[model samples]
Target chain A: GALKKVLTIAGSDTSAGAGMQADLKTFQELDTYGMVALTAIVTMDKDTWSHDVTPLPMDVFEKQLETALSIGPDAIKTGMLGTEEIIKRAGEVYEASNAQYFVVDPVMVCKGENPGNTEAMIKYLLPKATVVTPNLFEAGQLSGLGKLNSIEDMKKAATIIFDKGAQHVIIKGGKSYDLYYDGQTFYQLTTDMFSYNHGAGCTFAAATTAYLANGKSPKEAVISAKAFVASAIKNGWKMNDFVGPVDHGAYNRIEHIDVEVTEV
Target chain B: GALKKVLTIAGSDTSAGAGMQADLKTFQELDTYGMVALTAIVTMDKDTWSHDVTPLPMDVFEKQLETALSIGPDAIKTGMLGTEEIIKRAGEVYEASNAQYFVVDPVMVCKGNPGNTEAMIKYLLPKATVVTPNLFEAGQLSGLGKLNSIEDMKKAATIIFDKGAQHVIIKGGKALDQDKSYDLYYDGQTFYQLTTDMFQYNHGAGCTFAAATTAYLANGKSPKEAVISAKAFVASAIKNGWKMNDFVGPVDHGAYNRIEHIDVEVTEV
Candidate 1:
């Protein structure tokens, strides 16, 4: 069989830290044919580390989507769709693509308050998303929790998001930890924090998507994805002086290097 | 040290076999920060194996360059610039950025035809620190006719040199012979012939060479040293090329462990 083709519908990170850039890198490192439909281009001003997002027009975005879809992807992951109309269109196109696995990273701007993207995601994408991996901030917005400060709060938030439509909900928190809810039960996992972790969230969802592309169950996928991101974080290096991205190639780098393995 | 950033101004190959996709993958394998400004999307028709190129608008192409250049790149490579307008603009910006190394792969349409952007080469070649063209492209650009002999290849090199390229390499494969591949590297003062066994796998070889050249330069290799390393890299890549369907397969940029097969007989003539 051929290597799995993984599709990423997201923004382009000029820094190559997060968004579709991170997703494509993760997919490539996982030995998959990475495809993309760029929603926006996000450039980080090296001086202040502030991100400036310039979104592509709907028609242009549609062209990219059509081009990527022509290649045929086994699994798809989406991150940071800049506009509501783009989100709706992406949801419709992705729905029709008949991909076996769909992982949605409900990216938000703030840690507590909901951004405009949250509204669009919930309205247009949530119901179709097979797995929604939201960080502590986005989980709070999706569940209307206002602020998530504890493990229990994360679990509660995961449950709320799971109820809306996601077959599996993972509320990722600090320390590369997550509280997962699958409608039937709630489970939690945590690991030590890693520095230089700018693109950790996007990498995790992409890794999960890769696992799914390889025919792993969602729980199994999540577990492996955690370890993958850990390797990425472990090898994460700074972009300029401030921005650091998870080394998408780190998982492979781990085996080649002479280092003691940390249990995931 | 942080990863050296290398920007590729090129086209997109959906198969990931050639153009900017190959350039980015090669850059990634070399551990450089890869960036891109796509000029066109080249989709290979599976049935006929013909390429369909959709050129982006000049403004869109220029914008991608603006975005990529904003971060600053240490080195740059240009491949498959689909339009004269894009190439001229790219040359202008690339000149202004003052990147240390610029590799120009003078890609032609077929074996002999001067691609639509002949003027683009005139605009871009002088800015390039090194210009890598295969026998076909060299003949087209130099007006030296079809390269049939080593001396003819040398003549083409001299003619291309007259066009203002600082360094010129005429990549000679079957034009030299069927048994071996020869590449003549001329820095005006010396002609170094680099030879390797002709390999069947060579889909993205040109793009990979350009990328490897960019990577090595960013890593602080001398011009000759960079080209030598790039040759070795491409040879290693060819050995591990994966067969995709019934067509020409892509060389693996990650397959760099095979130093044993890199038998480049470098002789200065």
Candidate 2:
């Protein structure tokens, strides 16, 4: 059996509606290998949240990670973690393993609390991340701002995050306000975020990052991801009665596409 | 061909330790299908700092993405996204494609920022599908405060769930440092948590979480079980972990050493 390598170092959505599951799906849709290094697992519930969670056991984490890394992946991505120690632990392995591609999601809060995200946590791991994706609420929480009402504010916020450590800051507000990026060239991307599940953003951010390792450039990957996401949102199918993402149907748009011939 | 489908959306790690290539090996080792969706590729100065970066062109991204999806992956895991447009554009496709097992790693910083990370970008969307954070980050970003023990982390975890995220996880977080250094966890209604031996495992903790999640999920573990199993993996990893590099003692990828917990910031750093 063969595989395209992308690993997720984050939490599990018991609902299977988001988290690593979603990341996995997106990874497959976008055409790269997907692998996982478990951290936490959230079991689904009937009401507000999942009642059960099981983190990756220590010995198991090491062994599984060993097995996965030994196979080789084009990229590695992270999501919701349960502790600071895990961050450092992953960082240590990353330093020695000599792999490629590292994307971090400062998944602090779900839809709760004031800041919802932790600055100390980001500080602990930001230096290791290749890209940082912060939604508007997440951005404001980090920048010490609240409910930013304008695009300019988003841009400023992105700049601030960029300064913090992440060379690239994708300040996402598509679901709430507007989205912007802090790169050599500032990019303010306008898109509708409604109808999209909460995990939608993470899927995009993660999948987009995965592309780089396979050979696609950042711009190419991100832009292409934008279109794929839009279609998913527009399609909006029902998953177990709830709204879910659409398929990045490979055969939908272009046909007879040759990958090796194309350059990122 | 029967393959383990895994798509990557991430940035390059100089050491080739934490980026796209890493995931590829992981998938192959685990025996699964895989693919790539490039976001950004940067030159790594020997795994230290990314001096420059080049975004993957849009068309190429589309072609590769389309081709990959056709292959069909069992799971998906995402990494760093450099810009907001990329997030939005990708978000659009994600919404459309709606793959099974979507994992998000909201990367906001690099590996060299030391103890401080980029403050949580509150301006972004608080409503995540699922979130994974560490101790200092969970409390600081969510205004939950630095969790000291598993009890504290459990208490604070609810706040993350309440913040609009479907599910929230706080990893590598030491709930308390009493007998054995332990980490805390909260799913939603109850606390699904545990503690592991403090070992030489560090560096790719987040990557472990995300990657393990992808692995377990790909292997058919539920979110709750996935977290449980992943935590166990990390703990044992601490014991079997390896080491590398000169500046900072590296972690053994194969659990080759003893577990040790030394640093305790916020209290007596």
Candidate 3:
């Protein structure tokens, strides 16, 4: 069978645990073809583990996006769009592309520092997204909720994001459950959590994109992605003293985990 | 057990077939931790499939290398050093590094075009613990025009071995023999030939071989043993290779340990 093509417009993580590296590895493990259009390059300070983000020039970014979209990917996802211009251009090309699924990983923070164009992502890309995945902090920022302290608050945030034009909103509950909303009903997808999850968010979103590209329904994609990320975290290895990343190949290498989904 | 770390200093192939992508995939499949310091970014022409290489700025490249080496990689490999300056800098770092194994894949050509061969031979070759070159690269490095036979391959391997590389493995891969694929390993004293059935979809085979070799070395395998095991590993990848587009098909780097076993015949010739 021909492999499904998946493109990721994201930052290049030289450490290979997060960003484009993690996304590509996840796509390969899922038996899909992977392509990349890098928007930034991220490196970590060896001693301090502080992230350094360098945005690619607009022309270079445009050329890579053009080259990636030229293949007419089956699915496309965005991560770590560093600037407003990048967010705008990515949305423009994504809106024009024939790709079936567009996953918006509204990544606002990296290692706890906000280095992304949040306003532009919400303005340009979120409405065009097939599915929007936001962590608690991101959901809070997007929904104007100061902080989500409970599942009920998560539901409220999801509803707010859905109203903002996202077809589906998944608010990832840290070490707990993920709340999924589709404008009508809500599904809470839960699994056993593991701590070494540096790339868990990106992997979860990328896995969702891969499943959606393979014709899975939104619910199925979210549920399957939970298991994939769980397995990845379970198999995660440390890169250095400060951080560790989920194993993008763990879902393929190890036994699958159970993700329980219930209506709320 | 802690995962042995391996680093690749190379260009990024957005196609994910032949550059750092292939190398990192190989390292992961071998159960080794992988890192990268990208020297360039290569994108393909949409209609024609032609390669366009963009070299990273020297400071960016240097920073990545410093960060990668800070972890003290167990093994290191180089591919597609876009310019002479990058090559010289890579050599300087490799010489200073404490990495136990250095596998130099002298990737002078992408598709069919030559790139930075002269600089690679001068700066990178001598630093390699193991230098892997395909038939064309072997001939280029050995100062022989084109090799058509196993004897010609042996001569080229010896010449490269004499040029400061501790070991040389020449991938004959259907070039020396039409009916079967072959690889030559030389450690300055003996000639070992590893033979396997030819597989048509082998786009990333060369990079995978070198990366796997680096992994095995990091895991404490002998040079001969690394070559033998890497040959079978690459054969499995080829066996499971898939078409990405009409112009290129990449071997499944994740297919090595999962696929049915394929035997490679290693003999002293």
The number of the candidate with the highest TM-score is 3
Q: Give per-residue lDDT, candidate 2, residue B157.
A: 72
Query: Which should have the higher lDDT, number 1 or number 3?
Result: 3
Candidates by TM-score, descending order: 3, 1, 2
> TM-score of each candidate?
0.83, 0.46, 0.92
Instruction: Name the top DockQ candidate.
Output: 3
Question: RMSD in angstroms, all models?
Answer: 4.4, 20.5, 2.5
TM-score, model 3 to reference: 0.92
Clashing pairs in 3: none
Whose TM-score is higher: candidate 1's or candidate 2's? 1
- The fnat scores of all predictions, in order, read 0.07, 0.00, 0.39
Cand. 1: chain B TM-score: 0.94
Evaluation by DockQ, superior candidate among 1 and 2: 1
Compose the digit string of candidate 3's lDDT tens values, residues A1-264.
667888898988877777887888788677677778888888777788777877677766776776787777888899988788888987888877898788999988764234246678778887898999999999998887869999899999998889888899999988578899999999988877675688889999999999999889988898899899999889887767877878877777676999888999
lDDT of 2 by residue, A23-139 (tens): 765665554545566566454333333234545455545544554455455577777767666777666555555566676666755421123235554565566666777766777
Cα lDDT of all candidates, in order?
0.75, 0.53, 0.83
> Which 10-residue span in candidate 3 chain A carries the lowest summed lDDT?
A110-119
Off by over 4 Å in 3: A112-116, B112-118, B244-246, B257-260
Position A54, candidate 1: lDDT: 63
